[PDB]
Design an enzyme around this catalytic site. Sequence first.
Site, PDB file in Angstrom:
ATOM      1  N   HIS A   1       6.204  14.800 -11.236  1.00  0.00           N
ATOM      2  CA  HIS A   1       6.981  13.580 -11.172  1.00  0.00           C
ATOM      3  C   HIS A   1       8.240  13.725 -12.003  1.00  0.00           C
ATOM      4  CE1 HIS A   1       7.681   9.122 -11.754  1.00  0.00           C
ATOM      5  NE2 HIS A   1       7.411   9.163 -10.463  1.00  0.00           N
TER       6      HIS A   1
ATOM      7  N   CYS B   1       0.731  -1.272   0.000  1.00  0.00           N
ATOM      8  CA  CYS B   1       0.000   0.000   0.000  1.00  0.00           C
ATOM      9  C   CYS B   1       0.762   1.326   0.000  1.00  0.00           C
ATOM     10  CB  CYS B   1      -0.951   0.012   1.194  1.00  0.00           C
ATOM     11  SG  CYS B   1      -1.643  -1.601   1.574  1.00  0.00           S
TER      12      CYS B   1
ATOM     13  N   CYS C   1       1.316   3.988  -3.025  1.00  0.00           N
ATOM     14  CA  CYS C   1       0.233   4.862  -3.467  1.00  0.00           C
ATOM     15  C   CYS C   1      -0.362   5.736  -2.375  1.00  0.00           C
ATOM     16  CB  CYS C   1      -0.908   4.040  -4.059  1.00  0.00           C
ATOM     17  SG  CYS C   1      -0.624   3.208  -5.619  1.00  0.00           S
ATOM     18  N   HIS C   2      -0.531   5.168  -1.189  1.00  0.00           N
ATOM     19  CA  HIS C   2      -1.131   5.900  -0.079  1.00  0.00           C
ATOM     20  C   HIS C   2      -0.189   6.701   0.821  1.00  0.00           C
ATOM     21  CE1 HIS C   2      -5.324   4.327  -0.520  1.00  0.00           C
ATOM     22  NE2 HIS C   2      -4.726   3.340  -1.153  1.00  0.00           N
TER      23      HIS C   2
ATOM     24  N   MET D   1      -7.564   1.921  -7.567  1.00  0.00           N
ATOM     25  CA  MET D   1      -7.390   1.098  -6.365  1.00  0.00           C
ATOM     26  C   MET D   1      -7.552  -0.399  -6.653  1.00  0.00           C
ATOM     27  SD  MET D   1      -7.036   0.339  -3.124  1.00  0.00           S
ATOM     28  CE  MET D   1      -7.537  -1.120  -2.220  1.00  0.00           C
TER      29      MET D   1
ATOM     30  N   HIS E   1       3.670  10.311 -18.801  1.00  0.00           N
ATOM     31  CA  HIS E   1       4.930   9.805 -18.231  1.00  0.00           C
ATOM     32  C   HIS E   1       6.051   9.923 -19.273  1.00  0.00           C
ATOM     33  CE1 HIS E   1       7.984   7.218 -16.596  1.00  0.00           C
ATOM     34  NE2 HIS E   1       7.316   7.150 -15.471  1.00  0.00           N
TER      35      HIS E   1
END
Lengths: 537, 537
Positions: free
Chosen positions: B321, B41, B44-45, B82, B363
């Site tokens: 990014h 997790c 992402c979190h 998710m 990206h």
Amino acid sequence: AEQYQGAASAVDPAHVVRTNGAPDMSESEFNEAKQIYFQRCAGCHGVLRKGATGKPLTPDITQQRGQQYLEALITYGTPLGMPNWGSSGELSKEQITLMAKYIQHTPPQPPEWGMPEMRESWKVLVKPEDRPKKQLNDLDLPNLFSVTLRDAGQIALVDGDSKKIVKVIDTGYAVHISRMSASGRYLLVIGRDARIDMIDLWAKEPTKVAEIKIGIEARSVESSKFKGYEDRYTIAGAYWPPQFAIMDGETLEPKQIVSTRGMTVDTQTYHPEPRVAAIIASHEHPEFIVNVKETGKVLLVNYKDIDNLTVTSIGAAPFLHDGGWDSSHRYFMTAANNSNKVAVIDSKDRRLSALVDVGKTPHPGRGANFVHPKYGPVWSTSHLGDGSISLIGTDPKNHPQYAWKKVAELQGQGGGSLFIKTHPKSSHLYVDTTFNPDARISQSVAVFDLKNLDAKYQVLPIAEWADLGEGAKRVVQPEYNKRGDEVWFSVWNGKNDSSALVVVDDKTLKLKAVVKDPRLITPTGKFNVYNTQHDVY
Amino acid sequence: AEQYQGAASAVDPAHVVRTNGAPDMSESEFNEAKQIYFQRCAGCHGVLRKGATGKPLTPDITQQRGQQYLEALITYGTPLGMPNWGSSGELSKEQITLMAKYIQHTPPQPPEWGMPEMRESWKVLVKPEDRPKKQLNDLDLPNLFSVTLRDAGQIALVDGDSKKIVKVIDTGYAVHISRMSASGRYLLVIGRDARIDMIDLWAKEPTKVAEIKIGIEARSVESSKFKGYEDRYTIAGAYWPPQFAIMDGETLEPKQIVSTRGMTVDTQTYHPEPRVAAIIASHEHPEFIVNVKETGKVLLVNYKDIDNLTVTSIGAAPFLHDGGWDSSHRYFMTAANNSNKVAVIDSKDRRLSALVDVGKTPHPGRGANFVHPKYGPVWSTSHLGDGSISLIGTDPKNHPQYAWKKVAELQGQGGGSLFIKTHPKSSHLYVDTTFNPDARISQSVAVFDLKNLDAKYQVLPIAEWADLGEGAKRVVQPEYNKRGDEVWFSVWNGKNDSSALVVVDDKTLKLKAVVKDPRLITPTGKFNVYNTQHDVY
Ligand code: DHE
Ligand code: DHE
Ligand code: HEC
Ligand code: HEC
Ligand SMILES: [O-]
């Protein structure tokens, strides 16, 4: 996008620690201790406890010490600044037990305060369009005195010459200071609750035109003073959250919010609560000079382009607090009080000029500038830790041998001093001693003859001249009037007690007036409009 | 000093909240869930769970949802990014229950990482005085290829012309990128574990001369490239803690550490975990251009005076990014991927030139610059959310009508793309599609004819040309050689599987070589020394 952010975190689970092993305490118990913590401890130990003035009170440390070490320490205190809550009888054995248990738990989290909350709190009472185009009253605004009626959550505008309270305005709780806009029209005040009020001195009757709350707790406010930016921006530093906010200098609309959370100057480690202290507006560049306490950084926040903020982070020394301009208004003389140093910030070349060693816990306020017969121009400060008065040379050009050196010292009535004062037109130097444990000393101020500095000071019985009756009657912060012939003092007495403002004839050192009024509750800071606006100290 | 810091805190106790009401879980249970959280997790979190690509998983929110909602959501996921941990069978009902309970507790705290830890981790293997004065080997250093052997925690220097592995060097785990010092002598690599290794290419046999760990987790590293600063400083951004560190570009000694914790550009609220992404060295001023993800700020950190750091914080768009220079090396074309935008940072005038809307989850990597027959000079990027390829005009001077506009689009094999590539000497444009769910697409790259952009692309069976056998064999990141006649691709196969580096004759689009070696484990990023050092893309 799911398998791409699907690799394991480099962070080792084993090293991420859960917090506990704390003594069980019910909701009622935890809240009673939490209430005590903020009413008695928070000021010194911080909201989060990484520690300010003293050692941290985080669980890792507290649990290591254990229940009893903690109960005992809280009970008797220490000779290094930690008050004895048991011995003094301030808190009960029962309460101290509760606090020892409390500090063993993870510190509860206070709310943050971003733009949503700021804007919600923002209010324009009178739009710029609707405000007068000229002064609509016949007050001598320059000689007005903004006085903080602390516990009343108000401020009183006292007329310099008549000695009468011209207007009482409701504000944030316990306003910490008053600042004047470069134009000299608007009076900005900020409460410790972070509530700022902008007041128009040109209205028929001076009134608040805008208000806003920039945090949960704060102390400083300032206005842009660089040529061509009169009333452009208005900045304010906050204690919690660790941040400062730049606002429109006309309507107080929030524009930028900057976090002061960061790395310390000394250990270069992360500090989660670097409170913002003094803020002074630069005259050399379109910048604000912000003091960040716990990390000991002096920020030069350039507002030439507020959308893309440029900040020059200058290392100083830990525990930056107050300070002020040198005579020339180029060097910011600020005090890193618990480091026993005074940092010299060059606002022109934008660099730390020097770190001057002074007495224990210097507290200059905005300091006192005067020309010494032998040492040339100097900036002075008294202390809280002792009775010294440090005189630091501020003339690198014409007095290099004395620049940034503690050239001489004077001795006052003792420690607990808060403000030293003088004026270009005056030949006297005053020093108060508000927090001196002796009643007689704390109710009187010392005065030095600038024309004969070898001579001991004279003691003025300020509080006695007030003739108020009972109460601690602590005297605080000398403050001249526009013409510099009188010096004002606040007789900071209780809220249920009687207070007054004592005025002195600077030329004769004789009682000139005494301002009493049922509304003048707990008078603390006094700020003469002209002297404040033009940094005359 | 005690009664002075003795007044109550302005903070209301009532508003400072204790954290709990979470489902009870033993030490074993809490650790099993904590281990899962960081393996699956965290990416992402976030570490503190305040949300990144993933939503906020803080107790206030999780407890509101309750045990059931959480178990269900984790179990089936959502169509917005998710993953479905239950349906897919990745985690058991038992584990998902554990995770639902876990996210209902206060997030455990990972350690910080300041100067003490940095210095402790700092190592000078070979002092500057002991290092050679010239190149002590016959390698064609400019055409060397630094290849990341990801799971091996090493990198392999592959000779461009001979196609052989000249040296294998131990490094930090899963090195994320390679960067070259302006002199072209030192190779800098950084692992996701924040461990940086400086490698001398002039030693008889290229060897590490210095090392250091700048955090718990990191991705970027860069060297100062402004005229008169060759090898002066070396910067590195970290994921945890949210900070970047400036170091001596000769010995890697830590000098400055800056926290990126702060206010977001969009909501202007506090974010406790703004990870540092790409970092690119300015050629217009002595500055580093740092991307701060979650707060969407582009920092211009000036190193002209590293003791008194000046940083210009430019607002961009959230989730910055990767990205790279335009053809002229003045505009930093960076991607705010989850915002579906590409921010244009003017490194000369130091301001946000524009926010270009592109496809879903752009990206670019460092992007692909080429002169379009109709639209003039443009910078291109592929996406992860779709098969588009956005062409943005980058010539404000001679092509104002196309500057900062998504002038045209090309279509590739589909989404899951990671890197688009080209070269000044080449007439082809390659884009890979590494995380495309289709095996055939993910094992092949698309090639476009720059001389005829209306024509559909050609598909090169890279992984098939490798002839490796079983495994997902994902192809990734095209990369030219100094002469620009060959394009390299990494056949990123499992650690227990077989991998290879496929080379292509750019002129004919025909298989030229295949690099296999028992040591070439999980090859990912490849960085040709010259093309990297001189930002040739
Ligand atoms: C950071 C700071 C400044 C500088 C502002 C600037 O110039 O921008 C300042 C100035 C000031 C000034 C400015 C005077 C000047 O001439 O500039 C005054 C009058 C003042 C009245 C007090 N201050 Fe002050 N003060 C604090 C903070 C500060 N005080 C505290 O945190 C502290 C130590 C503890 C507290 O509980 O607030 C503290 C206690 C006090 C008092 O006890 C005073 C006497 C009464 C009160 O209201 O709390 N502070
Ligand atoms: C911020 C950032 C940069 C730009 C740095 C710079 O230019 O200074 C970068 C560059 C890169 C580059 C640089 C290529 C170039 O030519 O510039 C490569 C090869 C690369 C290999 C990978 N990256 Fe990367 N990458 C991340 C972060 C970043 N990647 C992530 O956080 C993410 C999404 C998830 C993760 O787990 O790290 C991620 C996944 C990957 C991969 O899966 C790759 C293919 C393999 C791996 O080792 O994890 N990223
Ligand atoms: C400043 C006016 C203080 C107030 C108010 C409170 N504390 Fe304090 N505390 C302060 C200092 C300067 C120090 C350092 C003392 C020393 O000589 O080291 C301390 C220390 C403590 C400690 C012990 C820390 C340790 O050694 O591990 C505790 C447990 C502590 N203080 C608790 C505490 C509590 C609960 C208070 C409010 C009820 C409190 N302090 C107020 C300064 C000040
Ligand atoms: C990115 C590749 C993810 C990984 C891996 C994990 N989660 Fe996630 N999560 C992600 C996103 C983009 C979102 C938003 C989904 C949406 O459509 O709104 C989420 C959301 C959740 C939630 C729900 C939060 C809420 O709305 O109240 C939970 C409870 C959640 N995710 C849990 C979770 C766990 C425990 C994971 C690892 C075992 C996990 N997520 C991984 C993206 C990603
Ligand atoms: O103060």
